[PDB]
């Protein structure tokens, strides 16, 4: 009644349990220490992406009040960002139907 | 008992169930681009080709003005790659890509500078390390970069005098080559329209067959398609100009693009560096570093000279695209050197006296006594086709060290039983059952529980023996097999995974603490951070700021094993 | 029940339903066949189409986008039935009205 | 009208229905079944047949038109009314 | 349920008490709920099958406090003997002073008798004007007191 | 506080199937099934966690708690467990589709059987406006002939062949199928490969033969991994979502179903309760899958395991189906038949509020009126909301109860959920407290909407509303021109009566499928409720040309007639 | 999703049998939930006969919405679909 | 007090066929929106008045008239600057709790950004000033910067359980305020 289809060298107290562990686990020599060389790779991966984020290329954006308040009146702006059509690029680049986007 | 709730919580077992491929390149653009970026990528990963329809249709964003701004700035940063497929009845369209290696920058970007920075000859002076690797992270972010802008930015003339004079070495070099339809063009589609013009200039009642106007057909397709990729791979057209009463200069009205094959190629002889400096002692290995150093700058291709994946290869005569990169590894010789000529690039720190006992002062006949070692070496690292000068294949030195690294993965992974068994799976074609037990004399609990736990993977395919007209692997033995091809094709999406699940935790980690990251990196904050952070917020910032910091080691300790299974 | 010692009821078969579906009478067939047959008030995820319990999605685990309606518990069973096999047949509502 | 003469079999209903549950009513359930859910069939409910295992309104007979009942409500009567400051307060800007 | 808009035209605080001063005279009536007939209606659930708590409640609670006097001191209730009339004469003043702001409904209801409070009403009010419109405005919004 | 709380009325507009990913087979479940125990005599059979008939998944009586809503058999609506497997298993349902699926990538690279541009137009042709079942079908059987057709595949040409099943439950390629008379770097390595084994034992000579690439779980489902994403459409698997993977298709984690759809039955046999088909299989499933958790660390003899190996592709096979050579009841046979899931079940049920006697004639009853039995009346009740037009009516009928005829059964007051059964309570205090929601489960009367039905159901005449008539035997009688439409000739015909329970349904029944609406068939138009035999005879009786009557049996006729 | 104007109507100005059988239903649910009745019951106490007599009178104040398969619809009120 | 325009579809019940259908509507409303609060909006007080109202419809087994009605709803909405004449019924000793009269009093003021010499003391003392504080339940002058909508509420079955077994962001409409300017804190500081 399958419950004597037991092997010779296997036990009988280790079946049934089951229960695989949550996550198999095998330490991994990827997980060494750190240097002055990986320190810096650490901060030029910091500088870099960031730099894309801080760039124009975003494209990731989906107190907004209905008042100008007079704070607000003659008041510093966040940034005047360089927006995707304010660099200039390569217009044989790219296909015909995405130069409308630029300010030409 | 692990909870449910508690499983798929730090489990992460809702992403084990993506696929590596796409969860990898999906988290880089997140991660660096943003969102939507994201979004437009994985579904390009999952619909090859598709027209700005259709993405408009397929996600959530239908503001055609919005995937298309999206669509240009991924198309700038190489990460898409399009075509115009001529309708004939209607309005023509066009079809857009995903460029594989345009977002391999975004991912080898420390490689990238490290390789920019180092590899040069000129390091002591601090200012030029700075200077090349501003201008490398401006090139490898903005994308098509252009002199007219640069020099135009630059303040001051003795300054643009020397900005100049570096964008014609990475010329040069490999690491500037003028941008254009190679790069935004899938190969298939470049085959396609460079494979049926052929078939349309041919005249009528030709006394040949179909079988010969093909083989034709495809000559001169091979021809023109192998020209017109050479033309643009290397070449001084770019800054073969020479002004008057000046200097030779690049165009300044051109846009440079900084390409990666060669990075590749750096990335790959460190890692045959590091190779030797394993197992060869450094008194003669420092001359390796240098012996691939001066020949990578012109070295052949290390997967596919892009014929082979455009079409297929062949049926009958299918030996005859290695047969002719062979061929042409051996004929050409630019990458054969001899031990004159290698005098002249070898630091003096390097004394090359020590480096040999011939028996129990820069010199040639010593640094060819390494030359001819190298050469008759048990890992072909070099063939000897004439006395006195040698080369360096890689039609048989990829698949051995391929599978030396494949199998120091399952070994370091793994036991060095494991690592026994599969050695004799390997050395030995078409083991069984009981020639474990003749070419290994191992204990055999042991041996089958190392046998089990590779049996997983796609090391070891095993085989079902039909013993009566019904197939049952209930009643007879089975015997084993190798089929090293899938064993390849599973460490590359594992390792693709991980690195996957790397960017995703630290995505999560951002997602975690987005303020105190806004916060850090603020014009102000920087450089002060002592005084302004208090004490608690401030540890909580620097315990996660060096787990990010730890975390970027990995992934760059594991950005040295994965690319060299990515080669054919 | 299908007994009439154990006090069973009357079956409608597939022949009256057709009948019933030939006079055109929509809401006798939902009274006949589901409200006094076996109707049953489930809880359904906007979000997955898979029947919750409690107004929990216990998938989605939020209980936001739980909708509540009216279906056979044989239609229920089957969904169940289903997703044993690992068939998910997931369930796409609307609203009714909006016009 | 779908062109050919199609039988009234198992094999001539599969014509255009992509109906699922109406193919699993009437006959060959759990090939229907999983060729539905390996394919992603993302049928529409439509049939009779699937709006009664749904428990939903069959869209024949009675239930093929709506009922509505009118407000009564007029025009009048939706107006917005004792407004001053939003004019007050442009005209003071 | 989607809410349409966020913000929709201002209300000043008159029409707001206006309006609930009008509900509580057109229905739930708190001077007549203070003597006892809960059956009334008789229609099964009491007055004509309805009944109105958590309206009452808040509709209560917003005139008590548009009804205790205008805290510019420490005698009228402040919002209520006022007319639509009473405001309207206030144009010509209203639309003379300029503020470049919605801030009007800040002291059309509050903060009387003290340049402070309007000194916090208008963010820099001194650095904008300071010279001589510092107590007329005073005394015209003091006016109903 | 109090937030809004909206509630929005939804139908359902379809149904998205798909295979369930591995993740959701988790997520759903609420416990893990892993141990091959339900009772224990060290718990005094007390189901606790962890066991197939785990209560946290359910319960089967009304006695017990689910502990994951705490609610009874009566309103628990069932959790679901699911199944670690180690070594992963094949599906029996998606057999044939996952042979197609390696019909389309070869096997080496996992690279789809086409070129670059090979179908990319058939589809682009797939993603037309105009496409049915019918034209899906047709393009993936072109795009499956055409890559069965294609050998090599185009990264890496490996000479694709048939793919197909034992004659067992296994998979099997044939990698050198046509090959011949040809020469092949990949075939001077099989041919060394055979030398390496042919030099090493003295029997395989005869049996080198097939021993082609089979495709097993585990091997199929590693390199389904391998498979990338941008080809699934052409496979037909939409790789937007997650589970569009082809690896879902593998059986990886089962998941245990609630214990409401494998119910266990009270006092059966021995006291000793007992369980069904479904839960004793997937304890032999989850007992096999420990087994084979623990071999992996004790080495078990691997032709052992892949005997095992073989045996749970067995019992998920009667699990799901059992059509393989036999009592055992999977989900696939309780879905099919006349009494399985849809035809038993789904459109055709037991219904409520329904009756069943013999049938006899009664000529004084109207066309459109059926005779019903006091004492079933009594029974059939119709649930009378209370208005302000009918409430003195309802208290007449509270007061009467259940027992005199013109009386009622059950109160549901306006506020309550459950009735107040009438056979006790003083229902003189009832009547008197009625309200105007509530609901009076009263008396079938005269003038009630019945639905009238004779079996087997020919035409839809077989089935009609008639207005009840209550009358002291115990048969349903009609009036004979109404046989006819019904086939009834009272000779122990037994008809079906049905008890609309709403309004809108009471409506619909008396005014589409009342008699006087149906006196003609559908089919043809002619009339079909009129003058059945005798009186046929007794018309013909009185027109006959030699009936003559005088004043006195002139007028009696007509007062009979009336 | 269009309403047809009432100037302009293409459908049937008869009632059809399904909707009279609907809009008796509908009212005589509408009746049983205690709705306002606009005819003299005369004694009767079921919301069918109720809604019948109605119909009778022309005085149920319900709306046919008869959509097209187009997806545009016209309204046609009880009293003025002719039976 | 701001206004707002929603859009809603109300169930109309047989019962309310007798009344004017405005009435009913706004009945309705007012059982939906009465004292409360909707989702990152505001706190409802009350229905103004009635913009849009469709034909109603019914569904097959209702018998109600559903509306698919579009109405202003008079709701508070504080911004940056309004004032507000607090009421106090609580202060701990974190940060008082600027009541109402019934209105909404679960909002705080930042002990931080409160006047920095306003501060708390274990043993219940009010107030040190470098000479003059003020007492619980009194008149409280304060300012608007910031608003947070409590819109986070995950619960499981068992959860809900164990807590109602045993038996918080209370509300989801949570203000704040400032005290850096003079003349705030009292409706009179001097005269
Ligand atoms: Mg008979
Ligand atoms: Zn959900
Ligand atoms: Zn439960
Ligand atoms: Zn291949």
Known sequence: NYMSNLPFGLGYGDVGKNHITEFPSIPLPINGPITNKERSLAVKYINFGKTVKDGPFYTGSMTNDGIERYSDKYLKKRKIGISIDDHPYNLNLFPNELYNVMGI | LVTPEDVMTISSLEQRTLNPDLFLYKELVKAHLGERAASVIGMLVALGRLSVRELVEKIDGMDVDSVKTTLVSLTQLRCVKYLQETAISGKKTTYYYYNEEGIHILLYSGLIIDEIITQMRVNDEEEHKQLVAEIVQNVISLGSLTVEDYLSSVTSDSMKYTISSLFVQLCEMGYLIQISKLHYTPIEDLWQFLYEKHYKNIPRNSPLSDLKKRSQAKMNAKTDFAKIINKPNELSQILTVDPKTSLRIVKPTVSLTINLDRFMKGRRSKQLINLAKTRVGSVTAQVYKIALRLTEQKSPKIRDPLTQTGLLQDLEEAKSFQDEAELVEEKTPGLTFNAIDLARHLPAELDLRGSLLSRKPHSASLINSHLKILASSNFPFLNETKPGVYYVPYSKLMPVLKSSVYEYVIASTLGPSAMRLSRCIRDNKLVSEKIINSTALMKEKDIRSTLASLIRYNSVEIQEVPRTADRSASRAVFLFRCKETHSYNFMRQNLEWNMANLLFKKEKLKQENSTLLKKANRDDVKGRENELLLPSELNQLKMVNERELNVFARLSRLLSLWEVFQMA | TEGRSRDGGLRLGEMERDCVIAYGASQLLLERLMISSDAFEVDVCDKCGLMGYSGWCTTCKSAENIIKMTIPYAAKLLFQELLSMNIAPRLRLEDIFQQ | YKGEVLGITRFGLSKMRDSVLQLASFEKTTDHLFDAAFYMKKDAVEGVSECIILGQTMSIGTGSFKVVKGTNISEKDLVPKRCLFESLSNEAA | MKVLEERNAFLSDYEVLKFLTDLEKKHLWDQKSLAALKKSRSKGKQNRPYNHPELQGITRNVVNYLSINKNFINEKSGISKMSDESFAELMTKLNSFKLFKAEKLQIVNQLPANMVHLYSIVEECDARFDEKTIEEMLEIISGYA | KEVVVSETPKRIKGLEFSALSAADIVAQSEVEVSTRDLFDLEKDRAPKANGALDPKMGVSSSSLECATCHGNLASCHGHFGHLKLALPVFHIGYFKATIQILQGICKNCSAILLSETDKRQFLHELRRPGVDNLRRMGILKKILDQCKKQRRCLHCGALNGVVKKAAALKIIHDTFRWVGKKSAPEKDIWVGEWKEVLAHNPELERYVKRCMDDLNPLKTLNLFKQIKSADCELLGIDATVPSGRPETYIWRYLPAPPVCIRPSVMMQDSPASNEDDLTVKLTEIVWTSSLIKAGLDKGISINNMMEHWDYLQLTVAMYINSDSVKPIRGFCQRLKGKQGRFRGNLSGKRVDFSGRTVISPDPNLSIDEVAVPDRVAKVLTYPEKVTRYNRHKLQELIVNGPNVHPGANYLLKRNEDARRNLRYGDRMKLAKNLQIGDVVERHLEDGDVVLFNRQPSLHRLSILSHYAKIRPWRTFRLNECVCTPYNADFDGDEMNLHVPQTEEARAEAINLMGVKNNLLTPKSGEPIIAATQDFITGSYLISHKDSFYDRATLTQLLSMMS | EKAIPKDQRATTPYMTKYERARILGTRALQISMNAPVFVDLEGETDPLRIAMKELAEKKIPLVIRRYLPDGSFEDWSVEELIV | ?191
């Not at chain 8, 066929?17 to 909006?41: E, G, M, W, Y």
């Not at chain 8, 509306?67 to 106090?88: D, Y």
């Not at chain 8, 202060?91 to 909404?104: D, N, P, Q, R, Y």
Request: charged share 25%.
């Open chain 8, 1 to 191: 007090f701001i206004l707002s325009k929603i859009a809603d579809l109300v169930r109309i019940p047989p019962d309310q066929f007798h009344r004017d259908t405005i009435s009913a509507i706004t009945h309705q409303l007012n059982n939906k929106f009465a004292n409360k609060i909707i989702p990152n909006v505001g706190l409802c007080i009350t229905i103004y008045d009635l913009l849009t109202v469709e034909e109603g419809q019914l569904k097959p087994g209702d018998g109600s008239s559903y509306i698919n009605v579009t109405f202003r709803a008079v709701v508070f909405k504080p911004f940056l600057g309004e004032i507000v004449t607090g009421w106090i019924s609580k202060c701990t000793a974190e940060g008082i709790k600027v009541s109402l009269l019934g209105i909404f009093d679960d909002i705080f003021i930042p002990q931080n950004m409160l006047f920095e010499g306003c501060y708390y003391t274990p043993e219940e003392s009010a107030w040190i000033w470098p000479k003059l504080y003020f007492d619980v339940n009194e008149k409280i002058r304060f300012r608007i910067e910031r608003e947070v909508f409590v819109d986070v509420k995950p619960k499981s079955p068992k959860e809900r359980e164990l807590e109602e077994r045993a038996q918080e962001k209370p509300p989801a409409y949570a203000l704040l305020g400032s005290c850096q300017t003079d003349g705030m804190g009292l409706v009179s500081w001097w005269e």
